[PDB]
Design a protein around this ligand. Sequence first.
Ligand SMILES: *[C@@H]1O[C@H](CO)[C@@H](O[C@H]2O[C@H](C)[C@@H](N[C@H]3CC(CO)[C@@H](O)[C@H](O)[C@H]3O)[C@H](O)[C@H]2O)[C@H](O)[C@H]1O
Ligand SMILES: *[C@@H]1O[C@H](CO)[C@@H](O[C@H]2O[C@H](C)[C@@H](N[C@H]3CC(CO)[C@@H](O)[C@H](O)[C@H]3O)[C@H](O)[C@H]2O)[C@H](O)[C@H]1O
Ligand SMILES: OC[C@H]1O[C@H](O)[C@H](O)[C@@H](O)[C@@H]1O
Ligand SMILES: OC[C@H]1O[C@H](O)[C@H](O)[C@@H](O)[C@@H]1O
Ligand SMILES: OC[C@H]1O[C@H](O)[C@H](O)[C@@H](O)[C@@H]1O
Ligand SMILES: OC[C@H]1O[C@H](O)[C@H](O)[C@@H](O)[C@@H]1O
Lengths: 144, 143, 715, 143, 143
Amino acid sequence: YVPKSVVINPYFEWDDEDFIKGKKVPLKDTVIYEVHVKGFTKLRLDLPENIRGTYEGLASEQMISYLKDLGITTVELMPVFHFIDQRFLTDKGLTNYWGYDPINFFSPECRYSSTGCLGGQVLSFKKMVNELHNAGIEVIIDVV
Amino acid sequence: KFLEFVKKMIQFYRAHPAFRRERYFQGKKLFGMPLKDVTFYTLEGREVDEKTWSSPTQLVIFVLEGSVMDEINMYGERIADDSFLIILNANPNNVKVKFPKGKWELVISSYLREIKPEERIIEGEKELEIEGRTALVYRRIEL
Amino acid sequence: FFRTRDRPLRPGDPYPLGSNWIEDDDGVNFSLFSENAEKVELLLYSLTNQKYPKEIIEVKNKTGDIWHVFVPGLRPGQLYAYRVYGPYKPELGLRFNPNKVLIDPYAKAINGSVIWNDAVFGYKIGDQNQDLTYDERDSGEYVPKSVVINPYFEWDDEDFIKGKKVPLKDTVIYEVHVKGFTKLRLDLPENIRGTYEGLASEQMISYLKDLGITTVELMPVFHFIDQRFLTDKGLTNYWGYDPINFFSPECRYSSTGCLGGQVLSFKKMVNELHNAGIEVIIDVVYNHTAEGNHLGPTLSFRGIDNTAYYMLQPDNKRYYLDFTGTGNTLNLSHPRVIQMVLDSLRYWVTEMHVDGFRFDLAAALARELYSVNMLNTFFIALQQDPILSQVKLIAEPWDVGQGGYQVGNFPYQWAEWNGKYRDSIRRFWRGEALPYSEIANRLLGSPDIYLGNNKTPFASINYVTSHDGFTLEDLVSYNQKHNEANGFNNQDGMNENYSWNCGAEGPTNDQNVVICREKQKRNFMITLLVSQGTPMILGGDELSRTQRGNNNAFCQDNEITWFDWNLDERKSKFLEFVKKMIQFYRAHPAFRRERYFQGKKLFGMPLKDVTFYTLEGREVDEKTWSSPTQLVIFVLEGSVMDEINMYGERIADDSFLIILNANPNNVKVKFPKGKWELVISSYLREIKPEERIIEGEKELEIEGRTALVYRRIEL
Amino acid sequence: KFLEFVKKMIQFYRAHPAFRRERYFQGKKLFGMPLKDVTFYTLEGREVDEKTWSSPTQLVIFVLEGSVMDEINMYGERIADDSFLIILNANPNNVKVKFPKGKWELVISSYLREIKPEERIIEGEKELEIEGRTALVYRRIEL
Amino acid sequence: YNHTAEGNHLGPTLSFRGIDNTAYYMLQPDNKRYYLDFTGTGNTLNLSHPRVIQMVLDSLRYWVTEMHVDGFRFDLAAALARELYSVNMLNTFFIALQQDPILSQVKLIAEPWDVGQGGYQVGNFPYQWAEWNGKYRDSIRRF
Ligand SMILES: *[C@@H]1O[C@H](CO)[C@@H](O[C@H]2O[C@H](C)[C@@H](N[C@H]3CC(CO)[C@@H](O)[C@H](O)[C@H]3O)[C@H](O)[C@H]2O)[C@H](O)[C@H]1O
Ligand SMILES: *[C@@H]1O[C@H](CO)[C@@H](O[C@H]2O[C@H](C)[C@@H](N[C@H]3CC(CO)[C@@H](O)[C@H](O)[C@H]3O)[C@H](O)[C@H]2O)[C@H](O)[C@H]1O
Ligand SMILES: OC[C@H]1O[C@H](O)[C@H](O)[C@@H](O)[C@@H]1O
Ligand SMILES: OC[C@H]1O[C@H](O)[C@H](O)[C@@H](O)[C@@H]1O
Ligand SMILES: OC[C@H]1O[C@H](O)[C@H](O)[C@@H](O)[C@@H]1O
Ligand SMILES: OC[C@H]1O[C@H](O)[C@H](O)[C@@H](O)[C@@H]1O
């Protein structure tokens, strides 16, 4: 019944990475944009389904362009620590949508990964941050 | 049409240092200028006093002196902006505010209606009516 | 209700000109020259909506005569265009129309083309005071938008070809139309047919590698517009010789299109070519624009700053000096225009990795006000430039204006198109008898033309055919020009085509005719590829390409100009001939020379490096040399050449004997001493077993219209 | 002593953006501020009128308004400085000068003697004796 | 760049005079045995020749990319604009220099004149060009 832990290959090429590292958004000109990875883009038929409401969906041209337009500088994602659906929510045909119930502190929630679930959640995440930084956008994660 | 409003508001915030500050406003004149970096007025035309400052209200009105700011960048330059006049009216009814000296082009508001052609400037300490639940920002273009 | 200053901005930089994705400051830097404008507006558009500005920024900073702004948040891909305000006074040259949306003359990508519409003209069209009037219809929705780009491209295998490449001296040029090349090549999947990507495909790369050419000269690939008068005829600008921007590659050749993908699609093509050991020379139009004269549209330069850019009637300044014959001529005297042209050249060199340029209507670049000057500013700057001093420069040595015939007059480092060569050689085989001189000279790299200026046979670009005029097929397939499909009542195209039908006009069945044509084709081909200098093949003549006697198919974007790859016996058996001829030229130094032949014995040898004989067996004399002829015959002494390589070795070849007979009738030539195996000819028939050697000063009969090369294997 | 002085003076130049300008002072106010970025005065308070701008002079005096300059760094920030009051008496004799309104502080002069304590701070349109061949820079601490 | 140590005629023959005398030096157009002297040092380099112009520009680029100099102050800069007999500030040399990728980024200061006739060229210099202000020098001295 309990999911299994996955050993991973931590190698990821942060192309264009390193330069944003560097006189970025100071707190003083920052404008924060609190987003739910899924809710962001679930109903965005603008993208092909199956990246709707995932990381990959969040860091797409379409979306990146939106945020760039909107004019926000940093995005604060809701909890992305792998979390569980409380039973009392399950027994009601319900789910933990917000995610504020972490079970592990190092793994990104699998239910947002387009690639899933086996190692692809962390790969899918890194690309998203990479993609964002390339666009001059900070990332702040809600942390439980 | 609101999306458009949030976009333009954000751009406003970003284009203006007098709102992205690393230091607080004190209530005084700095650098030997004849103005305050900030000033809180009453509903006519009047700097706030110890009593009006403690007593409640639904109408806030305040002036930020772009030029007399104590904001320094990382290169040791001080950092002028423009002088603004923010008029916040939460009063359910309308009110009549008296503008402080100088001349005051309109920039932004709550009004969803065609901005009356007599609201787009204010001169000479004269005054103007403001529908309840309304926010207005003004830019002094001459003092 | 905001201001131009409630939007986050920076003052930006005057340099470079154009728009620059500055990764580090997450924004774009917009630079635009104009010394006459009173105000400038940056117009930002979006993918979807292109009828109106998404946003309007006013360029408020200006260092000297250069307005500059930096908008945060803009990245690559962002569409933009320019409004320019200023004085409108067509009497004085001032033609500012801020209603007219303009293209950034420094754009490296341009979105669509122009949707033709009166509103793009900035005078009232139907008005009686044409071009004196001031039309104030917004034209945004019709003019394509400039695209900001990401210049990063990984030139894999790039850097090494950079490096002892094709010297002008062993070069063999192949003039091609990117589209026409490969439109009718079902060998590739469609949608790269007639694009860059199509040009640099395995299939094609292998073709060129086979054919044996070393460098390819692409027709104009500067983003260009279709003249309205061509549009209003259901027609197109197929050739492209009407540029509107000097930095952007034409979108109509990009497979990826059109948004940034034209320049990406181009770079890959050059990359792909270099990997195959192939140079790239682009046809370049710098002498005129697509804005034509007055009455013409207002798209780019006319709006931004008309006083510059454009040569104006100095007494009027309302009309345009036109030495190009296309309505206007670029003011190559204004510092900013000289910079733009030069930038463009450097841009296409260091950025797009071009290897050389063929300048169209060169002379137009050496114009001051009414006079030609091969020593104008522009040329001298071009000559001292560290980057450009290294690339191949080739010239159409003439413009159309008065006194614009500049053959032999271009500064060193320039090769010029030899129009003497083409005309003469064409009239020689035709049948005409020219003085033995006028042809021997041609055959020897036109020393008379170029040796008076310290140039070498390199500088002479020899060619029989070209995009201008007939094809090689239609050069032996016609006497007059059949350009009725152009829709100018056949009132365009050169009248003198120095051509001949071989006794007809158009396609034929008469075998005696076809045979003639097939012969001549090989007479031409033997010549070009045996004359000193640098030979140019017209792309397709190895396919016997036909334009149905259209000698001016500039607007024919169709089957008329399409490459036809369907090869029967005849068409293909010739392909084989061009291949073997080219290989011959390449395998033999005695034809790829850095020095001219003098007429003497060198290095203490008993022979001449060259020798011109008569019809029997006899060195030419002062009189026979000046008197006409239709039979040229000459010996090149491989061994007694003054050719040194870069390592200081002199360079033997074999001794040849070229016999050119343009005489319509047969003749009997007496072979000079020694023994003379046959190699190549015009004969389509089984080579007679008594023609395959000649000994002992004896003699042989030669059918008229026939070329023969011989190799002395014993003396 | 001179070496030292040149040092201190170069250090001053480079401290204050009002002198390392990228654009020219205009003769007028700016950014809707009362004070004008640059002003010239005469012996007495009255601003340099017309014929006084043409007629010769052995005495120059002018006030730079650091807080109302049209100066923008490469980041789109208006710069500001201090407000300074230059006195250039090239005249060989002494002269009395009337400071403009504010309250001023002595920053540097060409005086080799110790500066009298009543030159260190001028106030309220007050007057000051200026020896001939003497140059003085002043900062307005209050207004 | 404006003149050589080979003086006029009667001068020595060391370098240019000897390599090409019709190329490097502005010769009296009526004589060509005498040297046009706009510098006062015997001779004048003629930056109207394609190879002369190339050498000066080569040199400039050499000291920049090779010696990592940050800019030049040209001595008698005006004599560099003499092309024919007069100062054309629109000459080939200056134009090539303006459009040059490398020299485009460096500093270019000028002695804005020469000893020549009508050589005084204060303020007429191309942009990015700065000028030694001779009028300042004098005015301030006299003040
Ligand atoms: C060298 O440069 C030439 C001019 O740019 C090229 O010209 C060829 O293409 C031109 C568009 C064409 N223009 C004229 C056509 C006609 C009638 O035939 C008129 O109606 C137009 O107004 C003219 O502009 C030239 O005739 C044609 O030769 C040349 O191909 C390049 O190699
Ligand atoms: C600018 O350029 C000037 C000339 O190159 C410089 O000139 C200074 O040095 C020169 C060598 C000197 N030459 C003359 C001296 C005299 C008499 O004093 C004559 O006998 C010579 O024949 C002259 O050539 C100049 O007088 C001197 O000012 C200047 O310093 C540079 O800034
Ligand atoms: O004026 C234009 C003409 O100039 C020269 O005569 C060229 O040789 C010719 O080909 C061209 O058409
Ligand atoms: O003006 C054009 C003519 O100039 C010269 O006479 C050339 O020799 C000739 O070939 C050319 O057609
Ligand atoms: O001709 C050269 C002279 O020109 C001017 O008179 C300058 O003021 C002077 O300093 C310079 O030496
Ligand atoms: O002798 C020096 C003077 O020479 C000329 O007259 C100049 O025009 C002048 O500005 C300069 O002061």
